Amino acid sequence: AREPTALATAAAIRSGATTARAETEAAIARIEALDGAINAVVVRDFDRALAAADAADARIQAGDTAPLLGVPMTVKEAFDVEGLPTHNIATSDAEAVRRLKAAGAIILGKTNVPKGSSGGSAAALASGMVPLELGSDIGGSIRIPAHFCGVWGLKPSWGAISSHGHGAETPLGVIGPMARSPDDLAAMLDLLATLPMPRASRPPRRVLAITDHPAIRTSAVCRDAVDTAAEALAGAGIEVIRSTDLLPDLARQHHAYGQMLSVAFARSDPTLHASLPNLLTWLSWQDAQARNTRAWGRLFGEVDAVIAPPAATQAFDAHLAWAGVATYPGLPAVVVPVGTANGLPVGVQVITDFHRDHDAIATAALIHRLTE
Amino acid sequence: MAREPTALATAAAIRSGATTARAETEAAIARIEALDGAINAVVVRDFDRALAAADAADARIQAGDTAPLLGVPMTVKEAFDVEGLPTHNIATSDAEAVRRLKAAGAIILGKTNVPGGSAAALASGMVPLELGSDIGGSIRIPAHFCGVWGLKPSWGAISSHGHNGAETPLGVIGPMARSPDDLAAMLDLLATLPMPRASRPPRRVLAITDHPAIRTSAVCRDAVDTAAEALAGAGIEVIRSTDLLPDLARQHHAYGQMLSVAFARSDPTLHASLPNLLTWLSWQDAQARNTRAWGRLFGEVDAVIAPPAATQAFYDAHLAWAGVATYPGLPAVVVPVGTANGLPVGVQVITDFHRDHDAIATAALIHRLTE
């Protein structure tokens, strides 16, 4: 019995089948079993978590309908949690953490940063330690650990979710959920989003499948996974196309991702301050980025999603190539497991139009049902 | 954790028709393919022949076979030869301990690391049964670290042919699993000759926490003291000292010297620090005298509980706790007794030569009384 999802854990508690306190203790036991083996949870907060569970149950006794109430979960080390270090002890929750606690979740600890498989959120999830986790993703840190480990991840539309606590919003970067079921991604998006994202739905009718990218070779296995998902959609009465004149040049887009990424990964490297553009150049880049986003809007007038590889390889600045297709335009992107090959999980990334996040989740759910 | 079923319970399930060997192996495979992109233990897969083994195993079930681990999926260290798989060198016949596991009905899916591991494969729940080796802790110390059980048998109890010609002094091969019952069934399948059954609960136990050669983490000591309390509270005399305890400092030295020989036989550079033959024989005679000193201690106490290592999880003095048993050839079981600081914490139980089952038994007692 693969472990219950976050909403099913929520349902279980609400329905009296279990208590928040039995759920957190069980999580802790699961962490204490594997942790000498995966070593994911680098920061523990079990004692306050156990009291959180007790607060959470009292709320259940007096009719609180918070949707994730009593569900144990974890977060990247890069998010501030009041009381825990962020290595530097933090005196208030990050915004996405304040929302998860408000919604009733219980933060057991924080996981690594993915210093290729992870030992992080993704590990914590595939291992079944907790059903819910929260990462970040500027160059794949959500979508590519999830590929590697066989879990789901949402990289939202840019600016959908405050990353205060993780301060202007940082261009390209986002924060997003990771979990083992599409339903959880949706519930979590719906908790985290600054404003309500479109339902926007209906099933897709035409999908675009890419397998190659001018900037890296892409492992046969990574291509195969797309081609599998393409066949499953084709065979369910959905038009699948391999190419369109509306697809923005991906080679140029990569370059632009490069340039922009530098700025960020260089603001904090004093020596390389003198390779920064002037201000007018910089603003030329944002105007360029917006032009790209509107080109992707033109593509999404023809197709309802785009399915691609999340990365070049399986597990074990051109491994960034497949992350940038969406991170640069700010498009929403979901990674969904579609099989195993050579002993190792194999996923696909689904991409939809700006602010069509739920549809991404929905279309990834469709792909997963039709292949598993 | 819907903790995973034991090997004997998987065996019962199949025997009773509640499941098939083939559903059990498929499930294992799925569980490996889930975690493997995360823990990365199973470096050698043989899934397609495993799936046919499962079908051979079911046919035997349809003709009334009561072989004790029939259809149970398991894994083995990479260092054991399995016919068809490499051992890095493709191997043309099973190691002896593998021939026995197949005869007894088990299905070898693949092979794990040398330090994840067997221990990871187990703690992760991928398979209920695994087979390691241990000259300086490779069984008992991964098991400590991960919260699984491990048996380092009495030396010579089990052929390690296939793991170089003669059995290697000090080294053993042993099983790893998640329950004492499994260890016993496996010992009893693997042992060249039948080992004495466990014929009574312990009445006096010796609890050691410190060792002249290393500092031992408070946590590692605490776990012993926990195990001591559980036994004390069940009417069992627990003592912290006896004059019959063989000098552990000298024993360490002897372990040092002997270990070198082995871990140096095939390392040209160290060849000139090898003893002469008469020296070597002085050492074996010394080792046999130690084994009989441990026998004198085991006339007074029925077991010895110690730390399996100095620390929890995540340099030849981390071997100090392994040597207490490996040197005299004593049997040794490591059993999980709780957690501290987010990580599993175990204890090693040691009994007299060929009192392996008692070791398992006394470790079962300690585990029941603390969980």
- A344 at interface of B, judged by CB pairs closer than 8 A: yes
| Residues of chain B contacting A315 with CB distance shorter than 8 Å | 37, 40
Nearest of B38, B36, B17 to residue B75 by alpha carbon: B36
Nearest of B314, B320, B317 to residue B348 by alpha carbon: B320
Phi, psi of A209 (to 5 degrees): -110, 120
Residues listed for chain A:
372
Residue A26 to residue B1, Cβ atoms within 8 A: yes
A100 and A36 in contact (C-beta within 8 Å)? no
How many CB atoms within 10 Å of residue A123?
28
Residue A118 to residue B39, Cβ atoms within 8 A: no
Nearest of B255, B236, B237 to residue B246 by alpha carbon: B255
Rounded Cα distance, A219 and A146, in Å = 17
Rounded Cα distance, B10 and B16, in Å = 10
Strand pairing of B129-134 and B73-77?
Answer: parallel
Phi, psi of B90 (to 5 degrees): -70, 135
A9 and A19 in contact (C-beta within 8 Å)? no
Q: What string of DSSP letters covers B246-308?
A: --HHHHHHHHHHHHHHHTTTT-GGGGGGSPPHHHHHHHHHHHHHHHHHHHHHTTT-SEEEE-S
SS3 B184: helix
Is B152 tagged catalytic?
A: no
Rounded Cα distance, B266 and B168, in Å = 13
Task: At A314, list the tokens.
Answer: 């399986």
Assign domain A6-192 one CATH number from 3.40.50.1110, 3.90.1300.10, 2.40.420.20, 3.40.190.10. Answer: 3.90.1300.10
Which of A33, A36, A126 lies at the smallest CB-CB distance from B38?
A126
Strand pairing of A206-209 and A305-308?
Answer: parallel
**Residue A346's closest chain B neighbor by CA?**
B37
A232 and A369 in contact (C-beta within 8 Å)? no
Rounded Cα distance, A28 and A136, in Å = 24
| B165 Rama class: left (phi>0) / alpha (psi -120 to 50) / beta | alpha
Strand order in the sheet with A152-155: A41-44, A106-111, A72-76, A132-137, A174-179, A152-155, A333-341, A344-351, A305-308, A206-209, A239-241
Tell me how far apart the 2 most distant CA atoms of chain A are, in Å: 61
B69 and B24 in contact (C-beta within 8 Å)? no
Owner of token pair 């059954």: B197
Judge residue A226's burial from the number of C-beta atoms within 10 Å of its C-beta, 0-12 exposed, 13-18 middle, 19 or more buried.
buried
Rounded Cα distance, B135 and B133, in Å = 7
Rounded Cα distance, B223 and B104, in Å = 36
Which of B2, B45, B342 lies at the smallest CB-CB distance from A44?
B342
Rounded Cα distance, A41 and A49, in Å = 14
> How far is residue B50 from each of residues B18, B39, B54, B57, B189, measured CA to CA in Å?
20, 21, 6, 10, 20
Q: Of all helices (H) and strands (E), which one includes residue B322?
A: helix B320-326
Q: Which residues of A are catalytic?
A: 76, 117, 141
Rounded Cα distance, B228 and B230, in Å = 6
Question: What are the contacts of B237-240 at 24+ separation with CB within 8 A?
Answer: B237/B203, B237/B204, B237/B205, B238/B204, B238/B205, B238/B206, B238/B207, B239/B204, B239/B205, B239/B206, B239/B207, B239/B301, B240/B206, B240/B207, B240/B208
Nearest of A326, A316, A323 to residue A353 by alpha carbon: A326
Judge residue A156's burial from the number of C-beta atoms within 10 Å of its C-beta, 0-12 exposed, 13-18 middle, 19 or more buried.
buried
Resolution (A): 2.7
Residue A126 to residue B35, Cβ atoms within 8 A: yes
**Which residues, other chains included, contact A23 with Cβ-Cβ below 8 Å and sequence gap of 6+?**
A9, A12, A13, A53, A70, A71, A72
The coordinates were experimentally obtained by: X-ray
Amino acid residing at A74: T
How many CB atoms within 10 Å of residue A61?
7
Strand pairing of A239-241 and A333-341?
Answer: unpaired
Residue A127 to residue B123, Cβ atoms within 8 A: no
CA B309 to chain A, closest CA, distance in angstroms equals: 14
Number of cross-chain residue pairs from A and B with Cβ atoms under 8 Å apart: 87
Task: At A278, list the tokens.
Answer: 């002037």
Judge residue A196's burial from the number of C-beta atoms within 10 Å of its C-beta, 0-12 exposed, 13-18 middle, 19 or more buried.
exposed
Return the domain boundaries, chain B.
7-137, 204-250+275-368
Phi, psi of A60 (to 5 degrees): -70, -35
**Residue B116's closest chain A neighbor by CA?**
A37
| Residues of chain A contacting B339 with CB distance shorter than 8 Å | 32
Judge residue A301's burial from the number of C-beta atoms within 10 Å of its C-beta, 0-12 exposed, 13-18 middle, 19 or more buried.
exposed
A296 and A253 in contact (C-beta within 8 Å)? no
How many CB atoms within 10 Å of residue B360?
25
Rounded to 5°, the CA angle A33-B25-B186 comes to: 65
**Which residues, other chains included, contact A240 with Cβ-Cβ below 8 Å and sequence gap of 6+?**
A206, A207, A208, A209, A230, A233, A234
A213: Cα within 13 Å, side-chain hemisphere: 28
Amino acid residing at B149: W
| Residues of chain A contacting B40 with CB distance shorter than 8 Å | 117, 315-316
| Residues of chain A contacting B32 with CB distance shorter than 8 Å | 343
Nearest of B75, B66, B155, B145 to residue B107 by alpha carbon: B75
CATH code for residues B204-250+275-368: 3.90.1300.10
> How far is residue B41 from each of residues B127, B170, B345, measured CA to CA in Å?
11, 26, 21
> How far is residue A313 from each of residues A137, A327, B201, measured CA to CA in Å?
18, 19, 55
SS (H, E, C) A217-240: CCCHHHHHHHHHHHHHHHCCCCEE
Nearest of B227, B339, B246 to residue B286 by alpha carbon: B246
B175 and B202 in contact (C-beta within 8 Å)? no
